Design a protein around this ligand. Sequence first.
Ligand SMILES: Nc1nc2ccc(NC(=O)[C@@H]3CCCN3C(=O)[C@@H](CC3CCCCC3)NS(=O)(=O)Cc3ccccc3)cc2s1
Ligand code: NA
Ligand code: NA
Lengths: 250, 9, 29
Amino acid sequence: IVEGSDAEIGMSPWQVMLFRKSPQELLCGASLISDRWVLTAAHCLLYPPWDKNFTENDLLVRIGKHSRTRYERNIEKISMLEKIYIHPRYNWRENLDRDIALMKLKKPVAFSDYIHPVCLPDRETAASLLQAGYKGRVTGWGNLKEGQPSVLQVVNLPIVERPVCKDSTRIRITDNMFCAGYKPDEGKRGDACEGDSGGPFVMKSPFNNRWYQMGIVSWGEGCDRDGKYGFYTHVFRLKKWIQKVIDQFG
Amino acid sequence: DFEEIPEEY
Amino acid sequence: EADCGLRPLFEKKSLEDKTERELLESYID
Ligand SMILES: Nc1nc2ccc(NC(=O)[C@@H]3CCCN3C(=O)[C@@H](CC3CCCCC3)NS(=O)(=O)Cc3ccccc3)cc2s1
Ligand code: NA
Ligand code: NA
């Protein structure tokens, strides 16, 4: 996260770190949506251009974390993966369209003050909150500039008008994406960066005061560049796929 | 860079 | 879960984090 700040303890209890077994390293961000399911970006697990194609046994899920590098004894819980599910129409060849994947855990994780699932939006929540100007929140242990942070970083960013998102890049933007971030003329800044991929873009509903994950950190050209914005997978648009996988394999 | 994690995982 | 999105150390105890108000203030419509 670029230009964000340290997260408060228990501020993002659904935050998940995707951890590579060997070499031991941070692979991506992710989120807890139930005691057995974790949501992330498909490119965190499959991206042929960079010869990335992880299988279940290559990684681990660390939940309830705050510190990036430390083993948080008595706080974080480490889970193994039972199965990975990538959207069948995830477009890694062109523009990361449908950048979403699910991971089922071998055993249920116990909730605590530091571990708690985030909600997934229904049609009305998405229609009501996914509006230009409305701010969401992005969290991650990714790079601070285009070294690494000591603890989870957080930044609030405004959703941007679709025409503006499109005119900021040469990449083909789809309805399964939305972008967020400040304009150069707005002064404030902030953006997700390398390592933040797969992390959640959340919003707190003013209707029922619950947090909903509206997006997944997907891509950006550089980090926090003026005139550029961060792009996120539109979670509601792909919820039918999410429900299908969980109904069938859950 | 990362502190080792218990071998059990 | 019927308890999704309610944080143990925040919503559950009726405590607000340092910047959530920024989000609420942006939901002007
Ligand atoms: N707001 C954000 N910025 C970034 C920049 C690095 C990482 N990027 C990533 O994890 C993903 C992995 C695949 C390469 N990648 C990316 O986001 C691609 C840009 C993609 C390519 C395919 C079609 C959509 C655009 N790489 S990325 O920006 O380093 C490429 C780059 C473009 C212009 C100038 C300098 C570097 C996350 C974020 S999130
Ligand atoms: Na992240
Ligand atoms: Na209400």
